Design a protein around this ligand. Sequence first.
Ligand SMILES: *[C@@H]1O[C@H](CO)[C@@H](O[C@@H]2O[C@H](CO)[C@@H](O[C@@H]3O[C@H](CO)[C@@H](O)[C@H](O)[C@@H]3O)[C@H](O)[C@H]2NC(C)=O)[C@H](O)[C@H]1NC(C)=O
Ligand SMILES: *[C@@H]1O[C@H](CO)[C@@H](O[C@@H]2O[C@H](CO)[C@@H](O)[C@H](O)[C@H]2NC(C)=O)[C@H](O)[C@H]1NC(C)=O
Ligand SMILES: *[C@@H]1O[C@H](CO)[C@@H](O[C@@H]2O[C@H](CO)[C@@H](O)[C@H](O)[C@H]2NC(C)=O)[C@H](O)[C@H]1NC(C)=O
Ligand SMILES: *[C@@H]1O[C@H](CO)[C@@H](O)[C@H](O)[C@H]1NC(C)=O
Lengths: 592, 181
Amino acid sequence: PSTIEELAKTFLDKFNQEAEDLDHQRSLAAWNYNTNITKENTEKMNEAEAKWSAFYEEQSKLAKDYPLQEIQNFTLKRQLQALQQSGSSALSANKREQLNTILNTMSTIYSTGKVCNPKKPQECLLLEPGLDEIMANSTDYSERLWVWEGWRSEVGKQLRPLYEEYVVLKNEMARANNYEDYGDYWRGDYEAEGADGYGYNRNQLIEDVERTFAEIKPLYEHLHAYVRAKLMNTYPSYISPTGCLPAHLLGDMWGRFWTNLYSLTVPFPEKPNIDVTDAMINQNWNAVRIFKEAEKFFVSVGLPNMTQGFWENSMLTEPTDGRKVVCHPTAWDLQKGDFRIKMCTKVTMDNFLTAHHEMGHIQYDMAYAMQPYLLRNGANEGFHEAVGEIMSLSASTPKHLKSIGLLPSDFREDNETEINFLLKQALTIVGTLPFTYMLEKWRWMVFKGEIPKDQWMKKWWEMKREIVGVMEPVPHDETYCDPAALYHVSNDFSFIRYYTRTIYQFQFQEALCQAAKHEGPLHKCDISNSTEAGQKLLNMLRLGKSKPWTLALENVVGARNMDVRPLLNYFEPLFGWLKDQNRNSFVGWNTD
Amino acid sequence: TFGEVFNATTFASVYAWNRKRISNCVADYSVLYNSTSFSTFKCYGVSPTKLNDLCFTNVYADSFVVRGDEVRQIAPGQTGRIADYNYKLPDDFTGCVIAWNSNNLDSKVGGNYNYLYRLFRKSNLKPFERDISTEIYQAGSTPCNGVEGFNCYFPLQSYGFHPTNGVGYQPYRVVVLSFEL
Ligand SMILES: *[C@@H]1O[C@H](CO)[C@@H](O[C@@H]2O[C@H](CO)[C@@H](O[C@@H]3O[C@H](CO)[C@@H](O)[C@H](O)[C@@H]3O)[C@H](O)[C@H]2NC(C)=O)[C@H](O)[C@H]1NC(C)=O
Ligand SMILES: *[C@@H]1O[C@H](CO)[C@@H](O[C@@H]2O[C@H](CO)[C@@H](O)[C@H](O)[C@H]2NC(C)=O)[C@H](O)[C@H]1NC(C)=O
Ligand SMILES: *[C@@H]1O[C@H](CO)[C@@H](O[C@@H]2O[C@H](CO)[C@@H](O)[C@H](O)[C@H]2NC(C)=O)[C@H](O)[C@H]1NC(C)=O
Ligand SMILES: *[C@@H]1O[C@H](CO)[C@@H](O)[C@H](O)[C@H]1NC(C)=O
């Protein structure tokens, strides 16, 4: 006579063990493919994935067989709920197949969708390493424009039909799963069941996003006017001082990041931005040294140093020996206590900075290994790169790298450079906050039925001008599908992470700096050498997904919910400068 | 005289823990207690130095291999999965526990799943009890007809040992010496 909760717990224990084992085995299988791309290794990685995938579905059904309402241990309940989310198999089997075909085709199109300009048609560059390398450093409006509508026309026509069906299937699934619509499904991820004043509801998320964006908007506007102005001197005939910005000119295929506008919008080109790569190069540093310096950083605050297995097994540089591998930074938890990083790093300041967040990931991974497999993750999708970006912030401090011999003692960063850097930070960091919020607002509304198919494009761009203060060269009707041209949209990826993650980092860095009694501007804080912050950073690092991320956060930063104050505060210096620079000009968009 | 047990090529998996008894005191603990390799050597109810002076009624050598992490379990008053369902040692235990890293021997590239361990059991081992039954663990009220299904699980699973593993999840051998007074 063993209660349903009891019996269920027993289920989990068996799961965790079966799951751990299989996950490790996939993991290794995938690690050999990555570090060693070989036809055989490809085959083996797919096979092993297939067993993991199959296994997961089987176990998910069974999980459902325990009635969620019956469980009383919330800590238990949370692993359970997480497991028993049905996949795309909680509906017709004949529908399911259709859906996967849609998806594979989309990515497929998107994957290899090449565009060709009228002139030199035979050029017909590819999205991957073609257009993108243009949009980034091209100041010809005509060039940039053709590279913009082409992609949006070509794949758009193809993607529009697919997308509509895509929507219908996903709503059928969400509804199947007692969800209002796909939108509300994705808003599940931020749900908290702690129910002791720490609970969280998928409805609260929309309100909270909107509210915070409301508080961000002032900042955004002034960044926007400044950047518009500098652009005018570059693309003088097309921009209008009381209006929005034409999209193609934002450095990327979409204006996700104004990073590439720095050359154009640098406030003081006289003072070069401080690049410590020549320092490293001339000091005959190597990849290993970089990662070792990182390690020290974590140690100095209180974190463990990396496993022996980490140095032994990890790939930290491109294989000299003719092993072709895709090279992107990655931080792996291979689930048996084997932790590793796979960035084929090269010697630059940036890589140095990167390794501090990739290692940051790893330290997270290590921190919650005592938690059970299901609970073995950061409390929501934001935290993991929210914590692996925060180390890249302390690590980049001029204080910090002076400290480790980054430059000459008493470097004395001047305010001209300091502001110059802050702005660069803002192009990428504040640049994308509106972009992102507007996109997930469109998708959320679509999924709730708030937008008809014929009003799709009309409502999308109406939102772009209103919120992002961006406008499109040519009008687009409902033949054009533009939002699908973004990877994450057309590859069925949730997208609001980018926003929440960005508000997370600074609440963190601000609580850690406030704990390391740092004084003065928040952007020069460096937490190194402070165990006080370390221990308190850990205290949340250990929980993993085990407590409602609201409690997770409140431990670190004393607040149960997102607050944008630390963002504003981090950027406050650039703010005041921007108001000055915009003292004599117009701030705002006019929609047309 | 017991050199053969320690350096044996292969070890019993923990649920079938091996028991070997010795009749001759020709062998000494000089070589053992003075050994760099032994990662653990907790002697309970005795003095590791004092061992060479005495001889005892019954000597008992149980050998088996576990997860690094789990070595802490083999000791009096220890409650865990291994101590509950695999090799409980009685509190009033007088003897000595020995363990050493066994990575190079027991884990192979691509894994060595051959060592196993008992996951469920309807109740805890009695000190030094050995249970090797393979009957399906009927957690539920519904009885399982000798096949694992909803609410009944096979109770034996296999340690996965790879050279890459973490130390805690790395495989070390263990030998426990029991003394009769
Ligand atoms: C964190 O605290 C440690 C503890 O001191 C700091 O390490 C030390 O940093 C100082 C400043 O760069 C270095 O000082 C030099 O020491 C030598 C003697 O070893 C002396 O001849 C020089 O005149 C100079 O004072 C020292 O090398 C270094 N020592 C060690 C063991 O690392 C570290 O800089 C602190 N970091 C931060 C960010 O606060
Ligand atoms: C990269 O992958 C290849 C193939 O997946 C590995 O080649 C195998 O090498 C072992 C060891 O000699 C042979 O037994 C297999 O027959 C090989 N497989 C094939 C089909 O070539 C290669 O060793 C890997 N290289 C490393 C170490 O990264
Ligand atoms: C990380 O740093 C600490 C430094 O104290 C290491 O802890 C000890 O390091 C010495 C090495 O001189 C060892 O002899 C000790 O055994 C270590 N402590 C323990 C509890 O074993 C720690 O080992 C370092 N990292 C690694 C991977 O060993
Ligand atoms: C095991 O073999 C090695 C080499 O022969 C030896 O050093 C060791 O002492 C042997 N066993 C024991 C129990 O010491």
